[PDB]
């Protein structure tokens, strides 16, 4: 321990998390006090416990790889990212195995084809940090050893996962260009964004669905096609928006083109006319021309082989959903509801979908009950009627979304042997709002599973591979999130208790919430009940604490539509609509659990390439560095731990018999002619990075 005078250390600070302090007097070993001199000139005696993190030299700060730091601690990482980002305007930085990517919130001219080819053929460390380098390394490893790869981006909402994923795919399309199948696989993104992304208060272009795109390659490592897997689309988005949030983009693209002659038969108007698009109070995104976006969407559909007739059919479905949302449901007393058959919006809804308005009006306000002994028809209250109507709207959109993805996959098919593939994962990031519900619970659960997949490959596997070789290895501590995962997915867990309540015909949100209280309050450290609420619960996620409201958990987990309404659309004279509701028990939560299990396995059977995205500020400001919010994300992603294990990891390994050519004691002797840059195991030798390539020369 030598904290000599004149050098600097980091101490806690409220605003900037950490602050530098110069050691005024030299350090006497064992002393509890430290003579420091603050930046303001205020002297102090810091109560240390033999201690403060040492600040790295100004020569080592700002480097491309943070493993090159002398003192690996949180202040160093935070400080290095700050000056690289805030001052040097560098958004990419290497943190060992992972790439770190800071959201610039500004268009940077660093993705041109010239730069793409500049990265091609190069090694990982040869060039400055860039998403292209991560992609190149995956493409490089796919070719040299015929292994499937995965580009796995992560981070909270608005951190820049989708932008990273698309640029990674842009790289593959450029270097591995063969038919221009490359332009089609790239086109799959903007299509799914139009029908799958929506403005939230976290991100103007938030992904409300998860995607995993497998890019297939032939023996020449040229792209031959691709396949897209989607995960739980947000259905409530179709019929509900919070303040300053929008429905899916395509609804507004469609309304913005309502007066075009081609669309006039859809009887549309401004987005402010329709209840399903107006609810947020703002129908426009700053710096987005929805009409111009409609044009690009049409061009993109055409590029994928979807002509005018195909586009008008999906636009017809979309317009129908909007009109459905404006069907007037009046109250008849306090126990009954009513819809006029001559309701204007109902009539076009039925015309576009070839339905009979009488049957729709009837079964929006009544529910049939078959007991195989009698058939009871009970009226619905106005709230129940609106609910049944909205549920129908959400169902139509869900089928339409699946229909589009299914057709996209058909367009990207290939009649050939898949040599290898590179999967690009891009799911909705960790998010939390004032009011969190089932939607947020699922997204955060998904993110929890990704962190598990990450920790397993980076910390569990890598260290276990070293430990069982009998080599000296100080284990790196990392936050294992298996407990919170078990709390959610395992038996007697939250999602299991929810399914049980859903099986009860008299099941309710309140009773389910009570079963969570009894089972987990003062029983599971990760589960908490707020003192000033008996309608919610808070979970300690890896990223942050998140309070969830229990309202609507059963309904959303069931995700049902009344039988009579389904039959009406099943008898649709519109071929596309009839296809959606043709006849061909498990809950949303159970399906979501199972889907994610398959995904994790698919990722584990590939060589992962991780990218950690980070939102620097909450105001979408260009190159603004919010220390508190950033350090929170660095802790959640375990960046500091990742850098540490990356630093002390031995990249190159040799078996003893292999070592002789260039026995156990003979090799150890010749190696000495420092002692830290290699270690000897049971059947293997290991070396430090680049500490051998100089022998090759
Ligand atoms: N590299 C970047 N360059 C410019 N803008 C970016 C970049 N990354 C993110 N952004 C901005 O952040 C917004 C949201 O990014 P996105 O990738 O959708 O985040 P996520 O998918 O993680 O929610 C984008 O619409 C874009 O304006
Ligand atoms: O806002 V993002 O859902 O695309 O993480
Ligand atoms: Mg996204």
Residue numbers in the entry: 5 to 54, 57 to 184, 188 to 593, 621 to 698, 713 to 723, 727 to 750
The study reports:
Myosin X is required for filopodia formation and extension. Myosin motors move along actin filaments via a series of conformational changes in the motor domain that are coupled with the sequential release of MgATP hydrolysis products, Pi and MgADP. These conformational changes in the motor domain are amplified by the myosin lever arm, which is comprized of the C-terminal subdomain of the motor domain (known as the converter) and an extended alpha helix length that varies with the myosin class12.
To compare the structure of this pre-powerstroke state with that of class V myosins, we attempted to crystallized myosin Va in this state but were unsuccessful. However, a data set was obtained from crystals of the motor domain of myosin Vc with two molecules in the asymmetric unit. These two myosin Vc molecules have quite similar structures for their motor domain but differ in the orientation of the converter. Comparison of these PPS structures show that while the subdomains of the motor are totally conserved in position among the myosin PPS structures obtained to date, the myosin X converter is rotated compared with that of myosin Vc and other myosins.
